[PDB]
Write a protein that binds this ligand. Structure first.
Ligand SMILES: O=C(O)CON=C1c2ccccc2-c2ccccc21
Ligand SMILES: O=C(O)CON=C1c2ccccc2-c2ccccc21
Lengths: 117, 117, 117, 117
């Protein structure tokens, strides 16, 4: 949406990774992971609309990209259960975050692009 | 060294990532993460001797590489709290699991190299 | 533009890589590299308008991303002279190609996203 | 093994990339690429003994990893012709150069690990 976007690419096919489930959690006061938002990537491999400026407060967030479910639906047995992307957000004020992930059956890469709006 | 090894490289300095704390967890029947093994990477960026064949049974494992503290010790501002690598140990495949992680302040990749002696 | 786009990210700063020079070559009949197109990445780290559907014929192309010039302008001494991305294009008909590159001082990654228009 | 080593991993199969042809060139005074050294990766994905301290003088070097043929031998359709790694050898820094390449059909990364004995 505005504050948090996720974009996933498939390194085997050289294509957007479509229909990839994404779960976002936020660390609570008791140090447990509270469900914060979720969704799926579109045809373009992008997931917009996860949250709002209002809801996306300071905190430690975990973005779980369900890579195994993605590869299995393509008849592939991958190594990882999911990608995890854990980071502190907005601790110097609001930012826009794009979490990019590149997927291969035994590997993935991830990159944060952080903009000041 | 044997069943499980972790190797970490620093993409900013073109070096092994030395003295990086690494924690391994095993998923418990109640879906909590139980501490399993840990250590710090060597001068060569490697962490050997985390577990044994006997101890390393099939199951879901999480490897956390404490990248934020690594970068902070170098006076470099990082994005991630840590790199996570989550996977299922399988007895069908090759016997050796090497988790390799390539670190940048706002990006990391990880690959699993699964081999036989 | 339409047929060939280049997008570059900075893994140290978690930002688009701005003002990155890009040179594209095409292998000639005599197996030498003919200059084909060039440009620079914009504020968004993207380079559009390199070529047209008419000019972008079948062939072997080389996309040179001038990473050393990029890092030097930021006071950094990197390892690589430039990224090279060499590939056969349009050998099964016209496609759209996006060449993505992620830059660190001692490392880079690249990924092709290929669409059928 | 000594001054220059090349190591290659397969991100699709989670293995060393075996029997991969690797060519090293040195830039000549007329900006042509002169063949310098070559070989094929071992069972461990490594290529040692390319050059000697005596032979490996300062200059610009290009390492070409013949990835297209690697993937074709596995019946996997690749994007790149080859992976290129271009850099300047420097006597000021550490004495050992390890070029590591992580391969996917439509993506590759490469990092330089520059160390001392
Ligand atoms: O994830 C990584 O760090 C590797 O690069 N991934 C990129 C990615 C993923 C999804 C959408 C766009 C990208 C992208 C764009 C430019 C450079 C690198 C990347
Ligand atoms: O981390 C990744 O998956 C990217 O590649 N990483 C490699 C790595 C990390 C630590 C130690 C050795 C490596 C390595 C060796 C050859 C090819 C790729 C890689």
């Amino acid at each position: 949406k505005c504050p948090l976007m996720v974009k996933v690419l498939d390194a085997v096919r050289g294509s957007p990774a479509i229909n990839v489930a994404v779960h976002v959690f936020r660390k609570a006061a008791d140090d447990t992971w509270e469900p914060f938002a979720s969704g799926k990537t579109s045809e373009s491999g992008e997931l917009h609309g996860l949250t709002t400026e209002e809801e996306f407060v300071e905190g430690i967030y975990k973005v779980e990209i369900d890579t195994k479910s993605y590869w299995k639906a393509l008849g592939i047995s991958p190594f990882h259960e999911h990608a995890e992307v854990v980071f502190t957000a907005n601790d110097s004020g609001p930012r826009r975050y794009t979490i990019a992930a590149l997927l291969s059956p035994y590997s993935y890469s991830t990159t944060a692009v952080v903009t000041n709006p």
